[PDB]
Amino acid sequence: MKFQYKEDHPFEYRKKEGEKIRKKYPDRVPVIVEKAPKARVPDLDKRKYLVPSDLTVGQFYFLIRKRIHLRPEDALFFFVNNTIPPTSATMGQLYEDNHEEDYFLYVAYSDESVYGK
């Protein structure tokens, strides 16, 4: 897994920003959303998202898909730590199980059901 947010900011920078945003919004989670490398999906204008913890992963799927503006026939899959996250889980629940030491949740999207495919 590779993210352009890590190429732009070292860990010590990411940790300070993720630590401050979590103390300011304890009921929200910071999420980095980027396109998988070999994905044939349009790009997002923004990659840093502040998500309500009670929003489900399925609802987060639909909100990101609308921002990417996909055709109805376009497939879209999400990946957290090389695994498709559960639909019924909340973003706060997914954050607690998968956040990195910089207090960020990293999510990649692609048209393929395998991360690097």
Binding site: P30, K46, K48, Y49, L50, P52, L55, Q59, L63
Partner: peptide, 9 residues
């Protein structure tokens, strides 16, 4: 960079 707040509406 600045966070964008995600909401259902």
């Amino acid at each position: 960079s600045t966070f964008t707040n995600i909401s259902l509406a």
